[PDB]
Amino acid sequence: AAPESKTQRGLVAICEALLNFFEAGGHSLMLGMLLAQVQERFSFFDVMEDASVRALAQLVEQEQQD
């Protein structure tokens, strides 16, 4: 979809890390914290709650506002 210049940077970080990714059949929990370990360069049960691109963008923005 069309990105919005901050979540654009988030999704480019996701893609250059490794490539919602749950519905993609080639990804698992190991590759999940591979991506996650890339995104602490800027709760994992909340990642199993929802880990869409919008979900990661919302969680990173909320944790940065926290």
Partner: protein
């Protein structure tokens, strides 16, 4: 091929392959769903519970903490540090070998185990104390030594398997890869028998998985396979092992063959895929076509196919595409079935390929295809109507077209490895030309503990209530040739199996031999005197048994060669009447008949492999305790006791008398010249003499109110009356050879341990006729020097009744023939003595009582007592 000859394994909601075949024939589901409360109590995190996508189902084997450490010699401090898959595969391997009809530790050839194992999650609780107290990583090298590579060596150590012990380790086809490696090893002649399978058991015992979007696991817990509503699989846990043997050897040894493995094929995919974790079609097609090519089978022969059938969205059309590609040479239309075990029990991780192989081998042997669960409508990308496959939902009988059933199991790993195994029907059994069943059979059971014996008797009790029961020469044979004889043992003598099931349903004060066993270095023999015979004595034993028949035939021909006695007519072809009893009552006939019966019965007991230490005799019983010691020959013994009997027939009349007083008091009370005939007990004695003053002594003994009895004898014995007949055989005695003894006789006329030269003196058998046969001190001397059970040889239970009335010191006496009344029970009594000696610990060839041409069958296995071993650290 490679015959399957036995199998075992715990399962979800099962503990036996027959308690799993009857969960497939009942169309059961073996998944155990839970609720919220028991799961957080097991240790489910508060985040996993009340999660909207956390399913709460898995397939549970029953008891993962319950190991019988005492059976294998493991201390209850090393078995607590054992991974549960080690323990459960130990018990499963012992069960599988006992299911085969063999014992692992004493097979003739070379037996080797090829088995896999899932990841040891028990260490992930073991490290918490092992490292957060000493902060040392030394534990990890011990884990290298004794955990990850050493499951199959632990089984081969504790069960003494000499052949190859290899841990093959593939992702999800480990078990069928192990079966293929075992077939290769048996066909390259590295081993002569193999056991092959796998195990997957989780120290998280009861748990759910967090299903996610597009995840391989189901979002409902119901593993729907090959259906349009298939959302994935559900994780099971389970063990499983089969026992493999080359088919010509397995058909010559007479085992039970479930299904002959005719073909097999393992391969890999190798980068014909868009990503590493994505299956292929052409490699699976090569595996299936290669297995049917090696089997020599056109695909117009296979009638059942057990697909992998995990129920995921992506793997289901790939596997049916591969099956269609490999079966595309066929010309019939919907003629082959399809199935998957994972509907019932879930997707086993490592034991998946052997659960399907057990299910398929049972379906080949029984001949009825089970029912696939949850299937009512096909998949979108699978066309059942334009394929040779149909999926059934009811338990459907399996009839083929040519008359031979063929099958095939497909397994798929996660790394890429594909295995396929093509079975066949077991060949044409022929159980019609055999000679019939033996009339009675011994059922021996044994265990290391009284608890395990009680549970094993309970298991055989519940097994014997079925309508389908094996033969009596197929059962009992597996219990003698196919079980190890432990300490705490028991034994039945039966004729039909359902009444045996009722008797084991009691297993408490029930009429069967039972007790602990010991070392038991030797037996003692007792031999019967004249005066306890009946009619048809040894008739059943003559026609049933060959050793007794051969000895009696040589005695009868030997007697008829030199004398005019109508032997084999007075016993076998004689009518049951009192005229016959008075015909054989006299001394001219009674002595060689008792000699022939006791000699041939003694030869029978020595043919069954028991070794006598001491052989106490009684009057004529001493003449044949001589003959088993070989002091002179059977020809000499038989013609000389004939000469003796035809002398003692000329002696005049004389009566006996019993008295319940010791011989010192009798010798202080006797006044007339009447010798003591026999001293047998402190409270039993026999006096002799001419009948008039004997009746006078009996009538005067009535006045003192002491118990007495007439003994129904014509000629007086063991008194001074027979001096002429005693002297008149000296000239017929001296012309034969007398040998020093071999077996330890002790003499009942002196009550002394009798030596190797004083039997050889030809005057000892003269004075043996005259002196009292003072039995009680001889019996007490044998009880003093030895410490031994006693086995009477002869018709009556007289000497057993005397002996069981003496301090034997934990010992018991046993008869070998019924006391007249139940002559029809000659075949049941002599098999109930053998069943009673075998429990105490004596060494009898129990396989001599087998039958004509026995085979092995599938009985219940050992019943391990369940003792909890668990580190249990949060």
């Amino acid at each position: 091929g490679i015959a399957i000859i036995g199998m075992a394994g715990r399962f979800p909601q099962a503990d036996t392959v027959q308690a799993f075949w009857e969960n497939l024939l009942a169309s059961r589901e073996c998944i155990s769903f839970y609720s919220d409360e028991e799961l957080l109590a097991m240790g489910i995190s508060p985040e996993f519970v009340q999660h909207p996508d956390y399913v709460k189902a898995k397939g549970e084997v029953a008891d993962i903490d319950k190991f019988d450490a005492a059976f294998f010699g493991i201390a209850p401090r090393e078995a607590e540090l054992m991974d549960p898959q080690h323990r459960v595969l130990l018990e499963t391997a012992w069960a599988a070998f006992e299911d085969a009809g063999y014992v692992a530790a004493d097979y003739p050839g070379d037996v080797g185990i090829f088995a896999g194992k899932s990841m040891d999650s028990y260490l992930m609780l073991n490290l918490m104390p092992h490292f957060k107290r000493v902060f040392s990583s030394g534990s990890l090298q011990a884990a290298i030594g004794n955990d990850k590579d050493s499951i199959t060596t632990t089984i081969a150590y504790h069960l003494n398997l000499r052949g190859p012990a290899i841990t093959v380790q593939t992702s999800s086809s480990t078990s069928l890869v192990a079966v293929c490696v075992a077939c290769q090893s048996l066909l390259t002649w590295q081993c002569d028998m193999a056991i092959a399978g796998g195990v997957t058991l989780g120290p998280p015992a009861k748990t759910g998985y967090l299903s996610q979007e597009g995840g391989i696991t189901a979002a409902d817990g119901h593993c729907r396979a090959f259906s349009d509503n298939s959302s994935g699989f559900v994780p099971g846990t389970g063990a499983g092992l089969v026992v493999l043997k080359r088919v010509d050897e397995a058909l010559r040894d007479g085992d039970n063959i479930y299904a002959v493995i005719k073909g097999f094929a393992v391969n890999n995919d190798g980068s014909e895929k868009i990503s590493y974790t994505a299956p292929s079609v052409d490699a699976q097609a090569r595996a299936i076509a290669q297995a049917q090519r090696l089997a020599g089978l056109t695909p117009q022969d296979i009638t059942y196919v057990e697909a992998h059938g995990t129920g995921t969205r992506l793997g289901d059309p790939v596997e049916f595409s591969a099956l269609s590609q490999a079966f595309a040479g066929a010309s019939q239309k919907q003629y082959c079935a399809l199935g998957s075990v994972k509907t019932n029990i879930g997707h086993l991780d490592t034991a998946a390929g052997v659960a399907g192989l057990i299910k398929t081998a049972l379906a080949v042997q029984q001949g009825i295809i089970p029912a696939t669960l949850h299937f009512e409508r096909p998949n979108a990308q699978i066309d059942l109507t334009n394929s040779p496959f149909y999926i059934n939902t009811t338990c459907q009988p399996w009839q083929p077209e040519s008359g031979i059933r063929r099958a095939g199991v497909t397994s798929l790993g996660m790394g890429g490895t594909n295995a396929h195994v093509v079975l066949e029907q077991a060949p044409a059994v022929d159980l019609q030309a055999r000679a019939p069943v033996p009339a009675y059979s011994i059922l021996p059971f044994s265990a290391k503990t009284d608890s395990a014996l009680s549970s094993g008797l309970a298991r055989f009790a519940d097994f014997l209530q079925h309508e389908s029961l094996p033969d009596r020469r197929d059962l009992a044979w597996t219990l003698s040739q196919g079980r190890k004889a432990f300490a705490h043992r028991a034994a039945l003598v039966t004729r039909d199996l359902h009444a045996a099931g009722t008797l084991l349903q009691q297993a408490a004060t029930a009429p069967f031999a039972r007790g602990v066993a010991q070392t038991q270095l030797g037996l003692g023999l007792l031999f019967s005197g004249q005066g306890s015979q009946y009619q048809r004595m040894g008739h059943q034993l003559y026609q049933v048994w060959p050793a007794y028949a051969d000895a009696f035939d040589r005695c009868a021909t030997l007697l008829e060669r030199e004398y005019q006695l109508d032997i084999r007519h007075e016993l076998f072809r004689a009518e049951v009447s009192l005229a016959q009893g008075e015909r054989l009552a006299q001394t001219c006939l009674t002595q060689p008949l008792l000699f022939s019966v006791e000699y041939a019965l003694a030869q029978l007991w020595l043919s069954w492999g028991i070794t006598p230490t001491v052989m106490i005799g009684h009057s004529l019983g001493e003449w044949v305790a001589a003959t088993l010691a070989g002091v002179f020959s059977l020809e000499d013994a038989l013609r000389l006791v004939a000469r003796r009997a035809e002398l003692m027939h000329q002696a005049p009349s004389g009566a006996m008398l019993m008295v319940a007083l010791p011989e010192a008091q009798i010798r202080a009370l006797i006044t007339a010249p009447l010798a003591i005939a026999a001293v047998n007990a402190p409270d039993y004695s026999v006096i002799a003499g001419p009948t008039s003053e004997i009746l006078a002594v009996s009538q005067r003994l009535t006045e003192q109110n002491i118990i007495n009895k007439r003994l129904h004898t014509s000629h007086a014995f063991h008194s001074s009356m027979m001096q002429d007949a005693a002297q008149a055989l000296r000239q017929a005695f001296e012309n034969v050879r007398l040998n020093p003894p071999t077996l330890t006789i002790i003499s009942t006329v002196t009550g002394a341990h009798v030596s190797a030269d004083t039997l050889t003196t030809p005057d000892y058998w003269i004075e043996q006729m005259l002196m009292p046969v003072q039995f009680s001190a001889a019996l007490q001397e044998a009880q003093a020097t030895f410490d031994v059970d006693f086995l009477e040889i002869g018709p009556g239970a007289t000497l057993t009744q005397l002996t069981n009335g003496h301090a034997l010191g934990d010992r018991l006496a046993f008869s070998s023939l019924p006391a007249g009344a139940r002559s029809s029970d000659e075949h049941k009594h002599i098999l109930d003595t053998v069943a009673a000696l075998w429990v105490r610990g004596h060494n009898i060839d129990l396989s001599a009582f087998a039958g004509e041409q026995p085979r092995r069958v599938s009985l219940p296995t050992y019943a391990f007592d369940k003792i909890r071993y668990w580190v249990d650290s949060p």
